[PDB]
Design a protein around this ligand. Sequence first.
Ligand SMILES: CCCCCCCCCCCC[N+](C)(C)[O-]
Length: 421
Amino acid sequence: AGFQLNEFSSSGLGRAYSGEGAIADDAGNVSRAPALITMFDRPTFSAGAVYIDPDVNISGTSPSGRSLKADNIAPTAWVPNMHFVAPINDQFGWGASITSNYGLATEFNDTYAGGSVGGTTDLETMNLNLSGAYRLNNAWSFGLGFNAVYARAKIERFAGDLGQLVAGQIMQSPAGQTQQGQALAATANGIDSNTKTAHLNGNQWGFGWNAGILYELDKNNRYALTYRSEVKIDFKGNYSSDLNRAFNNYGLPIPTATGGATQSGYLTLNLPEMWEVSGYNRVDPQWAIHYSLAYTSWSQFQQLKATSTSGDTLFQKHEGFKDAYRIALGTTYYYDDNWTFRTGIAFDDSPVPAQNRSISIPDQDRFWLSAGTTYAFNKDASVDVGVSYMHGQSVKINEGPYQFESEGKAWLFGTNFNYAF
Ligand SMILES: CCCCCCCCCCCC[N+](C)(C)[O-]
């Protein structure tokens, strides 16, 4: 799922996020579907956090006989969540919440070899939704939400061995047979591994809305169709490139050189839209079943091109992602007043068209398996605890002169606190 994450609740995690938009057993879900609010008698609160601990790795060798082995580049994270749904009147009621739909954090060492294309890339995301719902007849329920999306990103690449490859390349030719090519090559074979090759950094707020639909057969069965729009973040950050201002103009496909001087960069982060369709079926007094099919247009994520005050290009990477689907199915078992339990499986096809593959966004079809429990205290309180094992598919990624190979697994763990009036 590119750099998109759906950890909005701990009860959600427990069921590998299925039926979401059709399950309102906690305020956690109104975030997915605005229409879910029309399902709450009383004011409900809930806030928790998801503990993400990935295990991605890179392996490989550089033409410079160097090691491209990038061990565990994915850092543990904490994605917390806060929700609040509350009735206004029998046909109307609003809600609010703080969630994070997107995120990314891959980091190698400044002395990595494939460091040209792998060094440090982070993305902090925080969606603030304020949705309102309107019931209609005994089955339909429309919902709408507004979103302010704060982001903090900081890209940073360094020169790995390219200077050495760059050098050899020159000398390996006629150029090398000249005090200049010999000089032009000496300059190149000098570049230490940790020479900041590019630094983009800036934070901004983005805006988007999201509508919802709810149609039910009765208090036990329903289906949903939701829509979360695209979000075009226009940053205004800082650009720094320690490469002398001489490497400039030869058109070497190298990120503009400032000379270590911080210039004023511009970037546009495109957060893909999401459509989703899920259903919920309680077939017994204890059993229930939910499933969903999501489609995210990663088509909208084409590149990341930086640009100066006067409009000239500094940094630029082609993503050319494409759309993709997520699929999920799970069950909820209502034991007694107290105990509740969940399980689930899911599968999402990566949007990265194998070829545009990149070691900074080591993505690979992911597989979810989750289990969780809930324990209500008295019809007004209840704590959530969820866990999920995620695994991917080893891919081959040819970038720059280099060729890598990344495999990755991740284990999840959330716990939310519920309260009502
Ligand atoms: C001046 C803005 C500087 C921030 C640059 C934006 C970085 C967004 C990171 C998310 C995309 C991840 N990727 C493809 C670059 O690895």
